[PDB]
Design a protein around this ligand. Structure first.
Ligand code: SF4
Lengths: 317, 113, 170, 105, 97, 83, 112, 155, 69
């Protein structure tokens, strides 16, 4: 089991490091740059050197900060971001929860708790601004996102994650639920703070947000947690909505199709980052409570009525 | 199982904090540990009272989170035998939530003060 | 094997720190440590829905409770658990009172409350082995069908809560 | 009730989950369901003051079932006698209690 | 079970001692009130789990919804107190004598 | 009768999200009342085996309650196996 | 004294047949052995007495081993194919190996 | 042999800092446009792996661009002092080198050498984006050829 | 060109197709050619507990078919 822990936790770190590499390369090719060509064979040794620069640089111990929350927020942030992968399905999961969608929802809010403790105990006015726009960002996203997960699991009757692939064996859930799918992709952009809905990391209205005073080390480990959340909710959107064909004789063919689909979804995520301009904390909350919450309440209404109109009551397992 | 995965995640991130702190060289002084705000010292203390501007929409975020935790047993309540009163109860409370958000939308407290 | 008693002593420690009342920014951290402890307690007891449901509803409430602590009720030089020494002395006094309470509670009562090799054996009373519905999710699913007045009164509480909060914050 | 409007209109609104022995989703009976059923059907309109001396045996059996206090006391003296007998060395443990045997299903 | 339930009763007696005194803020008292919300949920779910009375599972979500709704009412009450004062403290509220 | 149509088309052109939400809301309200498969959901949730329906005692009285499980007597499921 | 039966009363021929192979011979068990099994559940729901229903416990164990004796004597090899195919899957889902089920029911209708 | 292991660990710890060094989204000048032109995709930062972060706690090298006035001097030293301990400074342009224009002004600090250490002086009023991309190559080889663990060993 | 990103994206695809294939193969090697049973309800857990007590070597995965009966 610990062999499965090490061989699931090491190559997800290699995968998010290469996600930061293909972020810099895909934003480069979007922006007519070439991306980090000069180190490694085509870029491969850049994020290993980024970790080996940012972990052999030192962090601060500031006077103004609180030291216990300063050292206990980023250890949480890497633990929760690497611990949302353990109920993820693949063919057969590392850990099969009975109800794992609530674990994904709650511990995804606990990542924003790590961000929020960084924002308060970093103890800058910039960091307090970043903490309160984390609060306003989750005020925008959280009710909408859980109504989306509820209203799609009115088609798959349990909260289990293997039940999603035995529901999505025959067809994807993009085709019955594309008004769910577009607003879920927008809401998980709001979850994982990417460049349309990236406030709270900021970089173009304020300086850094949650990691203003957080130097190298804990800023790197937040960066580890943030891009782990990027590849995580890319894979979660990939398994829940465009979940591929599932063969019980060939799970590796389905895993290759799932990984081509997940690299397409991650390229779509970074493509959205280098295609759209950035929101505001007022307009973000405004349209995620105005143009989303009546629409996702009506989609909750329609998927409540969907085991009555077409009489598909979902099974328990 | 899951307690051991959570604890090896604790051990991995604590090992990363220990290799982030104890291995690099570090000299620290008062201007280095001075808090950053644009290149100057801050005007007041950084924990001075914020006057909050999203307060009523913050409380209806809290009450909407209580409604979605009310609405969380509904994927197993779709399997019940009294499905007429189940769908009437789900209809009347999603109508209650849409009318409450429509009241807040007409009263225009979504904008800050 | 002693999971629920170790977690319940940790809940006693976290509610003791919340009871000893720091700056409420730090009190939200202590109460959400107690919330993770209680979610893991219900998930170790057999409620696979109720612990994660209180983690969702409590993380989502306590987020903006934390935001209201760091906006409204903040202070220039706050008090954590280690700032004020009467609070720190009360913390170590409550810790030694807790372990003195269990050190007198395994000896006075002569019943099965605390035993060094006989605690944790009386935790699961009865779950059905061949039954199919033993988790807590279908019973709280039954408030849509059997106990419909609960959902009527909770939806009216939230409707009146929206109207009452608009009238308070106006 | 004070205003007995549920008994007046004849519709149960909070009354169908009042005790432990009420009806349950998908017919899964609670623990001490038979004890609660025999306690209510022994207090079936007797009254409170006469019932607390009449069905005191059935309440005492149901309270013993629900809280298991004399049962945990019995198992506490059994486990204390097991620790005393293992410290004495008289009690050879059986292999069925030790677990080193083929089990029946 | 009686060790867990008596330690939850001790946690409620501790949070009673917490919300029955005031140190500097009304908000830490409201955090003690929400500690009472969490302690009553854990106590109700532990009682329903070991008694296996799964028909009374509508009760602890009603505990959470009503007690967190009145907690949200008190959180915006502290917002209106700090709006009408500018301060927040317990000793600020002696103007009704 | 042109004012309601002009207001509906103006809201459709300007802010169509509330129009789509109220239309899908009214469709979800009225579509169980239209569809004939509303009555099949209670049939599905009744005719699922979910516990053990226990055998009953007999004195030679009832003929509808069968003895063999493959008897034609009782509530059959030709509306579910074939449909 | 709460009465409990002795260990020699519980000296039955216990069925040494596993989970997925029992799930393979689930519906044929309910097809064939329907008198003794429903007698045992009628005892256990109107008597509430596991000290009393042991004498029908011997009958339902004898019917289960007679049913498996008929299968083992007559229809062993498509049963081994079908229960190995059912034991391959995760939750013993019946959908994955319906091709073996037609061979199993054709062999059972041929011989038994 | 231990000195070979020490020098190869020194090269392995300096390879990361010479490749993935992270500069500063600075400003202040005419010379702010040419930092943006090294960001521009003709002579490119990000091909080397040279990323404009905004925070001084996350930065690794400071590109001081152009004029450094008397009001800007604590607003430059405060930022450099809150850079963490591998701190390299490029001075873009002649006003950050020694005060190209406004050497004799009342309100220019006469170069960035008066305030912080500057590890490479890149001259021009335009340093072209290729010219201080050469400058980031020369700082890259400078902290390649520095010896930290070697003089930790012989000490 | 467009084929420049695809080496790094291909080793990303290899190193992210390795944990699901690795956890399916280690579930097969854990449960001896069979897959790990999932206990969504209590009946599946009592079924797996009875599977362990039928096998008798404290093992879920090995099972007694008609070779014992
Ligand atoms: S160095 Fe030249 S180009 Fe740069 S700020 Fe000075 S005058 Fe302008």
């Amino acid at each position: 089991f610990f062999i499965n822990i090490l061989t699931l936790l090491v190559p997800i770190l290699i995968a998010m490091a290469f996600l930061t590499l293909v972020e810099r390369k895909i934003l480069g090719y979007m922006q007519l740059r070439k991306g980090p060509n000069i180190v490694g064979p085509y870029g491969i040794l850049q994020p290993f050197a980024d970790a080996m620069k940012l972990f052999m640089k030192e962090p601060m111990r500031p006077l103004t900060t609180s030291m216990s929350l300063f050292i206990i927020a980023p250890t949480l942030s890497l633990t929760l971001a690497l611990s949302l992968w353990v109920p993820l399905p693949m063919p057969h999961p590392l850990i099969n929860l009975n109800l794992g969608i609530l674990f994904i929802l709650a511990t995804s809010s606990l990542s924003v708790y790590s961000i929020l403790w960084s924002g308060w105990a970093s103890n800058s006015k910039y960091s307090l601004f970043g903490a309160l726009r984390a609060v306003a960002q989750t005020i925008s996203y959280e009710v909408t996102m859980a109504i989306i997960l509820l209203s799609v699991l009115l088609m798959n009757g349990s909260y289990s994650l293997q039940t999603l692939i035995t529901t999505q064996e025959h067809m994807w859930l993009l085709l019955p639920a594309w008004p769910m799918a577009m607003m879920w992709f927008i809401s998980t952009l709001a979850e994982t703070n990417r460049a349309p809905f990236d406030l709270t990391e900021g970089e173009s209205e304020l300086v850094s947000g949650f990691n203003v005073e957080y130097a190298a080390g804990p800023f790197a480990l937040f960066f580890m947690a943030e891009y782990t959340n990027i590849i995580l909710m890319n894979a979660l959107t990939t398994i829940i909505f465009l979940g591929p064909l599932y063969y019980i004789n060939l799970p590796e063919l389905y895993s290759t199709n799932f990984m081509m689909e997940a690299l397409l979804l991650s390229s779509t995520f970074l493509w959205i980052r280098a295609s759209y301009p950035r929101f505001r904390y007022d307009q973000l909350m405004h349209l995620l409570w105005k143009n989303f919450l009546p629409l996702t309440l009506a989609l909750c209404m329609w998927h409540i009525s969907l085991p009555i109109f077409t009489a598909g009551v979902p099974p328990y397992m | 199982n899951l307690y051991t995965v959570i604890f090896i995640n604790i051990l991995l991130s604590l090992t990363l904090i220990l290799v982030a702190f104890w291995l690099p060289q570090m000299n620290l002084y008062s201007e280095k540990a001075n808090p950053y705000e644009c290149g100057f010292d801050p005007t007041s203390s950084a924990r001075l009272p914020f006057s909050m501007k999203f307060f009523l929409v913050a409380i209806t975020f809290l009450l909407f989170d209580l409604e979605i935790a009310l609405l969380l047993p509904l994927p197993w309540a779709i399997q019940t035998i009294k499905t007429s009163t189940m769908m009437i109860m789900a209809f009347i409370l999603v109508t209650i939530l849409s009318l409450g958000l429509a009241y807040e939308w007409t009263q225009k407290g979504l904008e800050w003060t | 094997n002693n999971y629920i008693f170790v977690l319940s002593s940790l809940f006693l420690v976290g509610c003791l720190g919340l009871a000893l009342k720091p700056s409420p920014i730090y009190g939200g951290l202590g109460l959400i440590v107690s919330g993770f402890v209680g979610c893991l307690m219900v998930l170790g007891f057999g409620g696979s829905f109720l612990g994660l449901m209180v983690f969702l509803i409590y993380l989502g409430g306590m987020l903006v409770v934390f935001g209201y602590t760091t906006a409204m009720a903040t202070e220039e030089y706050p008090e954590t658990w280690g700032s004020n020494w009467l609070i720190l002395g009360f913390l170590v006094l409550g810790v030694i009172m807790e372990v003195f309470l269990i050190c007198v509670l395994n000896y006075y009562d002569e019943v099965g409350v605390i035993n060094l090799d006989g605690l944790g054996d009386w935790l699961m009373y009865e779950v059905d082995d061949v039954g199919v519905m033993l988790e807590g999710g279908i019973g709280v699913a039954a408030m849509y069908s059997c106990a419909t007045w609960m959902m009527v009164v909770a939806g009216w509480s939230l409707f009146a809560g929206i109207f009452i909060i608009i009238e308070i914050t106006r | 009730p004070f205003l007995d409007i549920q008994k007046k209109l004849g519709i149960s609104l909070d009354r169908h989950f009042m005790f432990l022995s009420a009806e349950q989703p998908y017919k899964n009976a609670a623990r001490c369901h038979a004890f609660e059923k025999e306690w209510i059907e022994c207090a079936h309109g007797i009254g409170g003051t006469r019932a607390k001396k009449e069905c005191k045996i059935e309440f005492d059996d149901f309270e013993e079932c629900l809280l298991r206090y004399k049962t945990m006391r019995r198992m506490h003296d059994i486990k204390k006698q097991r620790e005393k007998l293992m410290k004495e060395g008289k009690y050879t443990p059986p292999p069925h209690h030790s677990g080193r045997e083929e089990p029946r299903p | 079970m009686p060790s867990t339930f008596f330690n939850l009763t001790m946690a409620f007696s501790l949070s009673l001692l917490g919300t029955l005194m005031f140190r500097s803020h009304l908000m830490s008292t409201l955090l003690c009130l929400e500690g009472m919300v969490l302690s009553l949920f854990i106590m109700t779910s532990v009682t329903s789990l070991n008694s296996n009375s799964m028909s009374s599972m509508p009760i602890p979500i009603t505990i959470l919804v009503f007690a967190a709704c009145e907690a949200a009412v008190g959180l915006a009450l502290l917002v209106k107190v700090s709006n009408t004062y500018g301060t927040d403290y317990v000793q600020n509220l002696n103007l009704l004598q | 009768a042109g004012r309601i149509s002009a207001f509906l088309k103006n809201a459709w052109a300007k802010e169509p999200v509330l129009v789509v939400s109220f239309s899908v809301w009214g469709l979800a309200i009225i579509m169980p009342m239209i569809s004939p498969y509303t009555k099949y959901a209670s049939m599905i949730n009744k005719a699922t085996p979910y516990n053990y329906p226990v055998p009953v005692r007999d004195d030679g009285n009832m003929p509808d309650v069968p003895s063999h499980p493959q008897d034609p007597l009782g509530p059959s499921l030709d509306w579910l196996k074939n449909l | 004294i709460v009465e409990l039966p002795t260990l020699e009363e519980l000296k039955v021929e216990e069925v040494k047949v596993s989970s997925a192979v029992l799930k393979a011979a689930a519906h044929h068990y309910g097809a064939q052995c329907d008198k003794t099994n429903k007698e045992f559940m009628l005892c256990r729901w109107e008597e509430k007495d596991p000290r009393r229903c042991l004498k029908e416990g011997k009958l339902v164990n004898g019917c289960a081993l007679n049913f498996f004796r008929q299968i083992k004597s007559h229809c062993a090899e498509p049963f081994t194919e079908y229960w190995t195919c059912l034991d391959y899957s995760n939750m013993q889902l019946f959908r994955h190996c319906r091709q073996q089920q037609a061979k199993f029911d054709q062999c059972v209708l041929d011989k038994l | 042999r231990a000195e070979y292991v020490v020098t190869k660990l020194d090269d392995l710890i300096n390879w990361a800092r010479r490749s993935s060094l992270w500069p500063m989204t600075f400003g202040l000048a005419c010379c702010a446009v040419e930092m943006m032109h090294m960001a521009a995709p003709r002579y490119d930062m990000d091909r080397f792996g040279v990323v404009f972060r905004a925070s001084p706690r996350q930065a690794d090298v400071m590109i001081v661009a152009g004029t450094l006035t008397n009001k800007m001097a604590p607003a430059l030293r405060k930022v450099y002092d809150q850079m963490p301990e591998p701190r390299y400074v490029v001075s873009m342009g002649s006003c950050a080198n020694g005060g190209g224009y406004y050497h004799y002004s009342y309100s220019v600090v006469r170069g960035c050498d008066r305030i912080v250490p500057v590890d490479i002086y890149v001259p021009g009023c335009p340093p072209t984006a290729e010219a201080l991309l050469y400058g980031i190559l020369q700082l890259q080889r400078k902290i390649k050829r520095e010896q930290k663990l070697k003089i930790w060993y012989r000490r | 060109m467009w084929f420049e990103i695809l080496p790094g994206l291909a080793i990303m695809g290899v190193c992210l197709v390795i944990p699901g294939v690795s956890t399916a193969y280690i579930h097969k090697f854990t449960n001896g050619g069979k897959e790990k049973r999932v206990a969504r309800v209590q009946y599946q857990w009592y079924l797996m507990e009875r599977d362990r007590r039928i096998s008798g070597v404290n093992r879920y995965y090995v099972s007694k078919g008609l070779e014992n009966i």
